[PDB]
Design a protein around this ligand. Structure first.
Ligand SMILES: C[As](C)(=O)[O-]
Ligand SMILES: [Zn+2]
Ligand SMILES: [Zn+2]
Ligand SMILES: [Zn+2]
Ligand SMILES: [Zn+2]
Length: 207
């Protein structure tokens, strides 16, 4: 059994992707029979608004996972500490943000392990369970290697960057001055429709 190395770009999700994720420790949705939803952010760059996002999440008591890179950890230690201190989960977005399908196995292991160890040493978060691949690029091989190292492969069902359903995993952004306002409105609006904002730990328990 040679794992396939053909690259795929995540988007939404079809039989191929569905079963690739299912067999290799991946998910992109939670339970679709409950109105629980899951906010996530990717943090490979700091645009200057993450503190304002964090302020909104604290005000609204909404948990999120922030998938961080090594560049982000080294350059934004104070924001990282806010993430841990204010009840969020810090996820793994790789050290240098390469496409996982373009690197050798030794390099992929270093790219994940370096971030995991840095998150644990810098913030004291106990476990780093969640990986989101750079650019949502994956193969059968990269999914399987990531799972073997003890991580879930966490994709998304809705992304919004200015150019909802039960179980949605949202990938939102902190790119401009107005994003914090939009987030606050979205949280309020979705709660009025009966949605509950939960953590990726809750997702796993939702079974
Ligand atoms: C899926 As991305 C553009 O946050 O690496
Ligand atoms: Zn609920
Ligand atoms: Zn850097
Ligand atoms: Zn990224
Ligand atoms: Zn994005």
């Amino acid at each position: 059994m040679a794992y396939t190395n053909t690259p795929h770009n995540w988007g939404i999700a079809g039989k191929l992707y569905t079963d690739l994720l299912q067999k290799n420790g991946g998910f992109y949705l939670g339970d679709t029979k409950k109105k629980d939803i899951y906010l996530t952010f990717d943090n490979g760059y700091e645009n200057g608004y993450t503190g304002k996002i964090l302020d909104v999440l604290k005000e609204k008591k909404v948990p999120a996972t922030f998938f961080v890179t090594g560049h982000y950890i080294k350059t934004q230690k104070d924001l990282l500490l806010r993430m841990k201190d204010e009840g969020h989960i810090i996820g793994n977005h790789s050290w240098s943000h390469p496409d996982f399908t373009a690197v050798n196995d030794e390099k992929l292991r270093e790219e994940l392990t370096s971030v995991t160890e840095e998150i644990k040493k810098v913030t004291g978060q106990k476990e780093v369970k969640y990986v989101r691949p750079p650019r949502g690029v994956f193969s059968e091989r990269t999914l399987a290697l990531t799972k073997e190292m003890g991580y879930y492969n966490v994709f998304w069902s809705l992304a919004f960057l200015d150019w909802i359903h039960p179980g949605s995993i949202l990938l939102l952004h902190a790119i401009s001055k107005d994003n914090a306002e939009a987030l606050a409105k979205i949280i309020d609006d979705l709660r009025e429709k009966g949605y509950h904002f939960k953590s990726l730990d809750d997702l796993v328990k939702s079974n």
